[PDB]
Design a binder for this molecule. Structure first.
Ligand SMILES: COc1cc(C(=O)NNC(=O)c2cc(C(C)(C)N)cc(-c3ccc(F)cc3)n2)ccc1OC1CC1
Lengths: 46, 1345, 95, 63, 47
């Protein structure tokens, strides 16, 4: 009943941003850098 | 010191609209054919060549006394002009060809046991619809050859000659023709002078072939071709279309284009039910009449403000009547006969070629490559899902696993369990939602980009564009302003020698700072996205019969990227798509051949210009993910929209306002910038894959079974579906309904992606009937025999006019009348006609050699006479022209080639041919015919026995008994040129080439016996091999000593070398007959005949100092086998029987499957490992090392040599690659070894359908062989014996009207020997390889980490 | 608990409808032949209206014939135009 | 069908995930490439990652 | 019963992630279109 609460909350956000079809650049930057370091770790010894 | 400009003899090029306009505008001082910028520049600042042409013309009669017309308004008068008659010459040529042909016919009938047919060709009554074309061609060709001879001496020459009532003024840069009968003048190019000649030649060849076939078929049916064409009606067609094209100036070729469609409609009417045929015919007629209506305005708009504006165009009615008459002529030639319709496919050439406008096709495609396209997201994602599903299936089938998936959380439970189980759903599953939820998957890197640049990939003999700033170098200086010229001279001083070349070879060999690791960084860093010096040029070179087809061209840097992307797709991703890769050779020709069945044949010719980034990226992204790159498979739509389209042809300039930067010049008829579509051929594989994957979605949406074949530019979709609806309209209406419904579905599917299929390019049918452009109906194939023999004549397919290559080409082209057509006599007659013309009439005058050639020929002709004691000089040429070329005679077809296509041991075949030729020749004494072989065996074998010759050519002979070739004589020149180049890598490789060549032969010198095919394998296992390819690619360039100079002319050294080779190969027969040793024993047989296999083996052994070769000698089926005719009664031979009872067998099909002679080679125990990460070159290395390990076992030094090779090539030890190597389990590699230089198929010399109606029994011959030999292997090839038997069945029916019911081939056991597996002794010289691998490392593969 | 499942089902169904009906207009020249206009996303009719109001001259026509109009074919059987019947009468007759 | 009422939810939301993936690929084109934002839209792909490491270690080794 | 719920949550998280980048190319203004380029040019030197 807890994961569903987050689920119902996020559907409203998803529809809100989908109806438009400032801050997203920073989100994209942090997102790419999130997996860039992990991929580098895997690529870099065994 | 001496540079020559030998012109062309055949078209081999393109007819230019802008060059003609420039010539005419310079001569008239008014626009000609158009009022574009070309006319302006030509009027104001004409080029020096056109000024000289103008002066030459003015010196002669004045131009204002005649009506100026286009060169195409003159064909009717040019094709009807009569000069001196040439009937006696034609009669002489035909008589001599008949003599040579009767000698060959005696040869065939002697051993086929047969017992005046050439008398059916009556030379005194030639129709005269064959003679007129011969006379026209003779006169025009004489003029052209005289001009070529004159031009070889002086750089720029103008020659004037009168041909009847026409006067020609010919030059290398322009031509004029004036007609006194009509009082009119025309201006054209050197092309349009030797295309009219080609039209005349093709007309003569076609009419001659049909006349000969009709003469043969009127006395014995089945002796000629299986098509009955009237020749008078073909002449009428030629004249009518000539007149129609003359009236309709140059827009009439778009009207000639529809003859193929008309023939297709006739075929469909013959073979199908009215519903399909009427639809096709109506669709054709509507478009044809639309074009007919639109013709007049096009011409009247083009010729505005021109000298031709005052000429009158034909009205609608006259052109309509002309079309009616020509279509009547075509329809009457097809007398409801499907063989005539397939026969008439040769008329697409017989009328001439149109004159292509460089700046008009570009304009026409501009607005197609510019419009915005509205796309549906759902279909766009379904296509991506289908692509991903194809990839998943390919990996699951080949590797038994899923590709690595970045995130295994975008999958539902169904696809999660499918992932865990490592399989995929069946076609009955996979609804649309499956595609939608599959399109969410992202792959990880499964492949790789090679770190080193593949020198065999980039290096080619092609052209490249200049950079953006150095683009004014493609136009004459006179055509540009002064400021442009000054700034261009300033700019060309700052550029390097590599950024000044328009050729790839000079682009690389002249590079001073080349690096093999540069391309990897270039691709990974995406250093092509914002390139100011990027440009796409459109030189406008095209192909046949089209008003526009632009050949795109790019600078070298991005050319590398295009080549790399195409190669990576071909190697890694084109597999998984059997529909496309298997198109040519297996899929369509033989493999593919209530439940309603139908077919759709949509075209994909103009497929690239409707693609956009949004339609290509959805799959190029999957390719990038698989290969790990960022943007390498969608470069085109990322870079092309940012640059300028130029159309940089030599003459047509842009109208600049005096400014250097192309990106600043306002858009014109030849310039535009925002090109949103695709370029033709640059990303063809990806677009093909998307087209295939769209049909998967279409098939899933409906519930039909679709199979797609991609034969060229056509897509053939064969559709099946259980109709489950009957009791009303039974069978034909069901097929029609299925076809219509699926046509609607396919057109809707293509529309949703952005392609608007035209009504005139897609059609429906009941069964596929034009796959790869071959007409096959009900299992019988109807050939187009006279389509490859239209241009047979003197000096064909020769860079420099050399008789050897021209004769080989004549023979090769005429052998098709035997392979495709079912007539051997027609092919013999045509071949000997043109060979006699070449040798005895055209060798007296050579542009580069003069009379020398003929003198040489006349010496060889004397010697043979003196050797054979021929009384009449006329019958010594007949004998000489039936001897193989390998011994120094003129005969570019060996005997066996008429019965089976492939063989080992060419030498034994040549020996057998000469033996039978001397056997039938009841003109020489018996002593001399046995003395010829003693002369052949008299050798001076004491020479250097280098084993690299056998590595290059396992079937090579030594001691100068062979004929020399171009590669072996140009090798030293090419290496010497490459040694002096700025590129350090190439210079070092060329410096070490000689030593590496001398050392590669020493590795296996002390190994016995010598197995030349094992030596070939060892050769392929070394990097030297690859280098030896590059040299051979540069040897064939027509100018070796001018590679590093910008001359585009043939140097004197090359001419001297070529002439020396040509003159030295013409005396080989004289050389071998000079010395005879009388202490040589010929192995005569108990039949009174000589054993050809033993003579061949002795000759091969002696020429190599008696070094006991093995695995190369094999008997010829023509001499080790005796053919007789019975009914299940004879002594232990192979029996060939006929299924049916009918007399003849042409045009029928049988219950049996087609006979293809396969080898069933190398029973192989392949390993089980991942091979996806390895490039193709590394896989080939592993295969070569495996073959080396298999062939040589227990030989001292083998393991050390293999370790050296593995370390040199792959960089890792031999014991670390042992698991990766394949394991062969077989004892006789003399039989099972598969390698280049060793044929892997043994087909017969008849079409496939013809082999389906005979069957063979080999039990008695097996019993006989087991009685004589043991159970071990022998020399005789079995596939090849069966092929020869089938071809005998066919040829006997050809020569005699009745096909044998059964024939038996008895083997003669004195011609057959055994090949037990050999045991090798000696130690390998394994150290040398090290050095080689060090100095040829630029051609090595990438080292395995 | 159960009701929230139905609510999320409705939300997902309507989001699926919206994403199914969505259309894309490709990038291209800005109608001033200076720069490239980026791709657009929206309902088909509004995109078509905007693009056609943008288009000038011959280009517009082909767009109108390439996205608005389409080949209307029923049960096949293409009819030959009146002008194409004269070719048929000259070709198929007196043979 | 309590356990079946949320598996359909999963399949449907994975379908819209595929739709959004295709939409994202489609809209990052020539305009994005010239402004150097395409890679941020699609992401790094294990090949530019190796390139940066090699130069980073090469410079570190040069120390 | 529980794997399905967490899988749904993760898939919605990726849905939100995707929906964030979709409004930078066309729905986003051209003025800020060049903002990410500085960071991208900085990533080569940020590691
Ligand atoms: C593919 O390259 C080759 C293949 C062969 C080949 O196939 N050798 N043949 C047999 O070993 C064989 C054995 C037997 C036995 C087992 C005794 N009954 C019978 C027959 C046989 C033949 C014709 C017939 F009409 C009937 C039977 N042949 C030979 C040489 C080849 O290339 C190298 C020379 C360069």
């Amino acid at each position: 009943e807890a994961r569903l609460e987050s689920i119902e909350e996020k559907l409203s956000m998803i529809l809100g941003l989908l109806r438009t079809l400032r801050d997203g650049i920073r989100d994209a930057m942090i997102g790419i850098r999130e997996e860039l370091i992990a991929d580098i770790i895997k690529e870099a010894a065994a | 010191t001496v540079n020559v400009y030998l012109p062309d003899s055949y078209l081999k090029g393109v007819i230019s609209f802008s060059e003609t306009n420039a010539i005419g505008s310079c001569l008239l001082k008014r626009p000609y054919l158009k009022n574009d910028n070309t006319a302006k520049v030509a009027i104001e600042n004409p080029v020096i060549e056109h000024v000289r042409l103008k002066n030459a013309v003015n010196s002669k009669m004045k131009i204002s006394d005649y009506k100026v017309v286009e060169p195409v308004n003159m064909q009717h008068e040019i094709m009807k002009n009569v000069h001196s008659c040439e009937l006696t010459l034609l009669k002489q040529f035909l008589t001599r060809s008949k003599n040579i042909s009767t000698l060959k016919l005696n040869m065939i009938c002697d051993w086929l046991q047969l017992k005046s047919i050439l008398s059916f060709i009556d030379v005194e009554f030639i129709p005269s619809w064959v003679s007129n074309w011969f006379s026209n061609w003779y006169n025009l060709n004489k003029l052209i050859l005289e001009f070529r001879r004159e031009e070889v001496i002086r750089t720029g020459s103008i020659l004037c000659r009168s041909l009847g009532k026409l006067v020609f003024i010919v030059s290398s840069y322009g031509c004029i023709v004036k007609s006194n009968k009509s009082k009119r003048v025309s201006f054209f190019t050197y092309n349009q002078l030797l295309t009219w000649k080609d039209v005349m030649l093709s007309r003569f060849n076609a009419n001659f072939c049909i006349w000969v076939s009709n003469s043969l078929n009127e006395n014995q049916e089945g002796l000629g071709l299986r098509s009955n064409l009237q020749g008078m009606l073909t002449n009428k067609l030629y004249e009518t279309v000539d007149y129609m094209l003359s009236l309709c100036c140059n827009e009439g070729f778009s009207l000639v284009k529809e003859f193929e469609g008309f023939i297709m409609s006739e075929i469909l009417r013959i073979t199908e039910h009215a519903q399909f045929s009427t639809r096709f015919r109506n669709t054709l007629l509507n478009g044809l009449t639309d074009q007919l209506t639109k013709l007049k305005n096009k011409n009247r708009l083009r010729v505005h403000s021109t000298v031709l504006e005052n000429n009158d165009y034909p009205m609608y009615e006259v052109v309509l009547k002309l079309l009616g008459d020509t279509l009547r002529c075509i329809k009457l030639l097809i007398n409801k006969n499907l063989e005539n319709a397939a026969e008439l496919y040769y008329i697409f050439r017989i009328f001439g070629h149109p004159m292509v406008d460089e700046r008009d096709a570009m304009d026409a495609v501009k607005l197609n490559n510019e419009i915005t396209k509205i796309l549906r997201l759902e279909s766009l994602t379904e296509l991506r899902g289908a692509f991903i599903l194809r990839i998943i299936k390919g990996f699951v089938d080949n590797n038994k696993r899923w590709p690595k998936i970045k995130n295994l959380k975008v999958l539902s439970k169904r696809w999660t369990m499918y992932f865990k189980a490592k399989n995929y759903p069946s076609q009955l599953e996979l609804s649309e939602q499956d595609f939608l939820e599959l399109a969410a998957i992202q792959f990880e890197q499964e492949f790789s980009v090679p770190e080193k640049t593949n020198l065999e990939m980039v290096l080619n003999d092609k052209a490249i564009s200049p950079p953006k700033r150095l683009i004014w170098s493609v136009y004459p200086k006179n055509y540009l302003p002064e400021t442009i010229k000054n700034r261009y001279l300033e700019e060309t001083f700052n550029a390097s020698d590599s950024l000044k070349t328009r050729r790839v070879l000079e682009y690389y060999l002249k590079d001073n700072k080349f690096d093999q690791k540069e391309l990897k960084s270039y691709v990974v860093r995406q250093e092509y996205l914002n390139d100011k010096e990027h440009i796409v040029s459109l030189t406008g070179k095209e192909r046949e019969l089209s008003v526009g087809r632009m050949f795109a061209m790019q600078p070298g840097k991005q050319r590398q990227i295009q080549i790399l992307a195409e190669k990576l797709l071909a190697d890694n991703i084109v597999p998984f798509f059997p529909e496309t890769l298997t198109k040519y050779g297996d899929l369509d020709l033989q493999r593919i051949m209530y439940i309603a069945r139908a077919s759709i044949v949509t075209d994909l010719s103009k497929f690239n210009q409707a693609f956009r980034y949004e339609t290509t990226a959805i799959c190029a992204d999957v390719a990038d993910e698989l290969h790990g790159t960022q943007s390498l498979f969608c470069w085109l739509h990322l870079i092309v929209p940012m640059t300028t389209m130029i159309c940089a042809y030599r003459h047509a300039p842009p109208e600049t306002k005096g400014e250097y930067d192309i990106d600043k010049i306002e858009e014109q008829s030849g310039l535009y910038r925002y090109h949103m579509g695709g370029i033709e051929g640059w990303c063809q594989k990806l677009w093909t894959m998307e087209a295939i994957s769209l049909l998967d979605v279409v098939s899933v949406k409906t519930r039909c079974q679709m199979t797609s074949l991609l034969n060229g530019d056509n897509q053939s979709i064969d559709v099946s579906k259980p109709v489950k609806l009957s009791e009303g309209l039974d069978e034909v209406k069901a097929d029609y309904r299925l076809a219509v419904k699926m046509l609607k579905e396919i057109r809707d599917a293509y529309r949703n992606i952005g392609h608007k299929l035209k009504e005139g390019e897609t059609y429906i049918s009941r069964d596929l009937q034009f796959i790869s452009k071959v007409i096959q109906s009900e299992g019988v194939m109807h050939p187009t025999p006279i389509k490859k023999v239209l241009r047979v004549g003197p000096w064909i397919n020769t860079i420099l006019d050399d008789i050897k290559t021209s004769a080989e080409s004549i023979g090769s082209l005429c052998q098709e009348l035997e392979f495709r057509g079912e007539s051997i006599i027609v092919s013999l007659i045509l071949r000997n006609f043109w060979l006699y013309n070449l040798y005895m009439h055209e060798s007296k005058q050579h542009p580069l050699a003069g009379k020398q050639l003929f003198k040489q020929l006349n010496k060889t002709l004397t010697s043979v006479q003196r050797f054979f004691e021929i009384k009449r000089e006329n019958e010594v040429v007949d004998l000489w022209m039936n001897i193989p070329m390998q011994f120094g005679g003129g005969d570019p077809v060996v005997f066996y080639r008429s019965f089976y296509r492939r063989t080992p041991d060419f030498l034994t075949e040549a020996i057998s041919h000469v033996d039978i030729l001397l056997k039938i020749s009841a003109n020489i004494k018996n002593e001399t015919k046995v003395s010829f072989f003693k002369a052949l065996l008299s050798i001076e074998k004491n020479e250097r026995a280098t084993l690299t010759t056998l590595m290059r050519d396992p079937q090579a002979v030594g001691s100068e008994r062979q004929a020399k070739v171009t590669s072996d004589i140009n090798r030293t020149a090419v290496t010497s040129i490459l040694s002096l180049s700025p590129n350090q890598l190439f210079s070092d490789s060329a410096i070490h080439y000689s030593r590496n060549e001398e050392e590669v032969g020493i590795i296996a010198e002390n190994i016995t016996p010598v197995y030349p095919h094992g030596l070939r394998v060892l050769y392929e296992s070394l990097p030297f091999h690859k280098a030896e390819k590059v040299v051979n690619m540069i040897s064939g360039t027509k100018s070796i000593t001018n590679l590093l100079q910008r001359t585009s002319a043939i140097n004197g050294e090359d001419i001297d070398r070529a002439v020396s080779m040509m003159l030295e190969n013409l005396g080989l027969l004289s050389r071998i007959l000079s010395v005879v040793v009388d202490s040589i024993e010929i192995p005569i047989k108990s039949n009174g005949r000589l054993i050809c296999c033993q003579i061949s083996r002795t000759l091969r052994e002696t020429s190599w100092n008696n070094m006991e070769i093995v695995g190369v000698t094999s008997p010829s089926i023509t001499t080790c086998m005796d053919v007789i005719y019975a009914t299940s009664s004879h002594l232990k031979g192979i029996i060939i029987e006929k299924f049916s009872t009918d007399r003849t067998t042409r045009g029928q099909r049988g219950p049996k499957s087609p006979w293809v002679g396969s080898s069933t080679q190398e029973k192989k125990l392949v390993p089980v490992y991942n091979r996806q990460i390895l490039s193709k070159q590394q896989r080939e290395q592993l295969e070569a090392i495996g073959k080396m390990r298999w062939v040589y076992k227990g030989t001292p030094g083998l393991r050390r040599l293999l370790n050296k090779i593995c370390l040199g090539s792959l960089g890792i030890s031999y014991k670390c690659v042992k698991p990766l190597l394949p394991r062969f389990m077989s004892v006789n590699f003399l039989h099972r070894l598969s390698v280049s230089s060793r044929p892997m198929e043994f087909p017969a010399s008849v079409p496939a359908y013809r082999t389906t109606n005979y069957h063979f029994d080999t039990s008695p011959i097996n019993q006989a062989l087991s009685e004589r030999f043991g159970n071990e292997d022998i020399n005789l090839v079995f596939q090849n014996a069966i092929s020869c038997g089938i071809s005998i069945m066919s040829v006997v029916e050809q020569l005699t009207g009745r096909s044998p019911k059964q024939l038996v081939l008895i083997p003669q056991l004195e011609e057959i020997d055994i090949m037990p597996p050999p045991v090798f002794q000696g130690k390998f010289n394994y150290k040398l390889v090290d050095k080689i691998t060090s100095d040829q490392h630029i051609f090595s593969p990438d080292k395995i980490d």
